[PDB]
Symmetry: D2
Amino acid sequence: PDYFELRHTVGFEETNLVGNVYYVNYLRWQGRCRELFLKERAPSVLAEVQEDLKLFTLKVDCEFFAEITAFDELSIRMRLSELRQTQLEFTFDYIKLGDDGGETLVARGRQRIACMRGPNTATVPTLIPEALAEALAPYS
Amino acid sequence: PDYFELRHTVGFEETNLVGNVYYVNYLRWQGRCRELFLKERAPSVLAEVQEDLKLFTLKVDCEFFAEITAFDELSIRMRLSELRQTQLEFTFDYIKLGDDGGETLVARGRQRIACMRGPNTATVPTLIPEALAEALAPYS
Amino acid sequence: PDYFELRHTVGFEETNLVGNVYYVNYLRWQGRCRELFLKERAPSVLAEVQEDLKLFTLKVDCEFFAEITAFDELSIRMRLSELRQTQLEFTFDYIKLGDDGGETLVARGRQRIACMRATVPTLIPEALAEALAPYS
Amino acid sequence: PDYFELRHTVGFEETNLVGNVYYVNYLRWQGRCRELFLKERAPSVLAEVQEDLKLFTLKVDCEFFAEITAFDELSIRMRLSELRQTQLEFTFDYIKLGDDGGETLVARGRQRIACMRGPNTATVPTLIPEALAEALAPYS
């Protein structure tokens, strides 16, 4: 499809007092989708982050359209929004998989990431790694 | 004076493998500061949450200007940026407190909230509770 | 396999400052293993536990033997250690899968749950017991 | 008094859809109480662990006797149950603070920590740091 998919059933312990989901959990789901992409599409990046490659998070946000609860089936879909020189922006479509087959959008979020180089103290900008740029081809 | 403050030292477990802090943690702290203000300044609101009053987070965001490591002293400053009759927006300044007295803005977050009442099906908005609006006066 | 398996790869953000895994994450993985088991093996329980039934955790624990870091492949095996009329105990084996195919007992934990349904000490749901028959 | 206290109000987002508290949340609290202790009473330990010193958690557990919900006032009390030459055991008593001054033992958890030195494969038991042994003095 146009997106990278992360299937996730809403945990019983991922809800609040009034049955709704803690807004932080949505963002945890973003990281779980972003990291899963790097494990299956660009493992080359993963090893570089353990070295001197640092994927700085510039901005992350999320808007909530509908309230979800426990045991609701979700399809967190990631799409490449912007592709720049040393930066890139993702987009996360939180969709609820209804039993009938409906696909409603319960939330949407995006994440701005910059690529840097060198030690944590003295850093420098760097191009988006080739493997990562190629893996983001059908997901724009 | 201009803000409500949450004191926080960056945890040893809140720091990852390379010395960076997961952005999710910023939003966890942002959530704590939102409840500390309530439980202190407007405790009456919390009694209403268990009843009919519902607090809907419409949108959250956070921008990052610099990286931090464990044992960094943070001053999470919460101030009211936007005030409406049914909604409000909280701004969160993440001030990295220096040992010499310096103050470096390391991050900034925003949180749009909507005051709701009623059942799970038919939610209706409500005027911002008197005590909640009262406690927001010196933080405008 | 006499156990229920949950495959998990240690997240880059699940590690701490010195490159080790926060112990809280270990029990975080226990919940996901218990949840996943209930989902596939006894879906009737989940439909029962949300309105009246309550699976109350009496005791959780976890002892650690070795240390693991990011991207370490883990095979979390769950099995029924003790079965009773109102209570049941799970046991979780934390096995680090070597790059060649070797296996290492990194950690091991237990969870003690009492069935309740403001609550009433109730029988273990028959559907839950039948799904546990292999993993006894 | 005879323990290290961490006051904590049960969060609205820490409680699930049935009114109970996730058992994982209990352990983050005692881990927070542990880190806050090392932060306040023995900061030297927090710097040595970044080198060759290791605070290896041998075993951790927690027993639950009651049910708590949102906005409950808790008093987490950390004591020293056992101290060896290289090992130590903490005991966490979760005390629910009532409005009428009543106190109730809600839960109890413990944690065994082994002090070791050197790289992961060359790990060897080491004596408790003098800063830590001095910090555990008012628990004798």
